[PDB]
Design a protein around this motif. Structure first.
Motif, PDB file in Angstrom:
ATOM      1  N   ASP A  73       2.649   3.478   2.890  1.00  0.00           N
ATOM      2  CA  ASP A  73       1.652   3.826   1.743  1.00  0.00           C
ATOM      3  C   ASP A  73       1.034   5.207   1.876  1.00  0.00           C
ATOM      4  O   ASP A  73       0.058   5.240   2.265  1.00  0.00           O
ATOM      5  N   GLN A  79      -0.433  -0.122  -2.261  1.00  0.00           N
ATOM      6  CA  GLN A  79       0.720  -0.241  -2.947  1.00  0.00           C
ATOM      7  C   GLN A  79       1.887   0.617  -2.556  1.00  0.00           C
ATOM      8  O   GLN A  79       1.602   1.629  -2.198  1.00  0.00           O
ATOM      9  N   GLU A  84       7.790   5.580  -2.233  1.00  0.00           N
ATOM     10  CA  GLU A  84       7.446   5.447  -0.993  1.00  0.00           C
ATOM     11  C   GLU A  84       8.281   4.785  -0.132  1.00  0.00           C
ATOM     12  O   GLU A  84       8.461   5.052   1.139  1.00  0.00           O
TER      13      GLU A  84
HETATM   14 CA   LIG Z   1       0.993   3.771  -2.311  1.00  0.00          CA
END
Ligand SMILES: [Ca+2]
Ligand SMILES: [Ca+2]
Ligand SMILES: [Ca+2]
Length: 190
Positions: A73, A79, A84
């Motif tokens: 992250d 998230q 990512e």
């Molecule tokens: Ca993120």
């Protein structure tokens, strides 16, 4: 100098994003997906919500999400996006090809999934335990049964914790389409 993921590798890693981590199929992994994962397993094995299996699963998944966030992250929003995710795996594969071990959150998850598969507790995943779990993720039974025979070498190898762990690594990093570990989460047509 260095290298990206091959199509093969990228698609194996996106497949696991989509099927096993992003439980609400919205395109990102969040703690919300883990809560869902927890319900799914409790339903599969009939675990009561306030029991020790449930509570131990939750604790473990917390550590795993904590490690995943730390690794992937980048913009710190709690998230993890497909962007990512792939960026991280690019570095996890290279590091593995150079001798390093996979990240600890990942090994934790592997061991937790092994435990989820091996409901008999005998350190061996049998064919029925296996299809019971992957069929719950949408994998067709025929792709569970074919994959199981591949993974156990048609029965010459017991799918123990250590064998599952090796196969697990091979899924995520191997660029060899003949590798057994390619079928750990159901048969890949190759
Ligand atoms: Ca993120
Ligand atoms: Ca999600
Ligand atoms: Ca077992």
């Amino acid at each position: 100098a260095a290298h990206q993921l091959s199509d093969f590798q990228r698609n194996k890693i996106l497949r696991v994003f989509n099927t096993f981590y992003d439980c609400n199929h919205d395109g990102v992994i969040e703690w919300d997906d883990f809560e869902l994962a927890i319900k799914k397993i409790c339903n599969l094995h009939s675990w009561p919500t306030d029991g020790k299996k449930h509570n131990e699963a939750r604790a473990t998944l917390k550590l795993i999400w904590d490690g995943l966030r730390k690794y992937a992250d980048e913009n710190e929003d709690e998230q993890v996006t497909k962007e990512e995710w792939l960026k991280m795996w690019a570095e996890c594969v290279k590091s593995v090809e150079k001798g390093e071990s996979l990240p600890e959150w990942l090994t934790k998850y592997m061991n937790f999934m092994f435990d989820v598969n091996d409901t008999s507790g005998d350190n061996i995943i049998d064919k029925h335990e296996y299809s019971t779990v992957y069929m719950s993720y949408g994998i067709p039974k025929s792709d569970c049964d074919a994959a199981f025979d591949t993974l156990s070498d048609g029965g010459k190898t017991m799918v123990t914790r250590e064998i599952f762990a090796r196969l697990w690594t091979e899924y995520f990093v191997s660029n060899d389409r003949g590798a057994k570990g390619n079928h750990l989460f159901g048969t890949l047509k190759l």
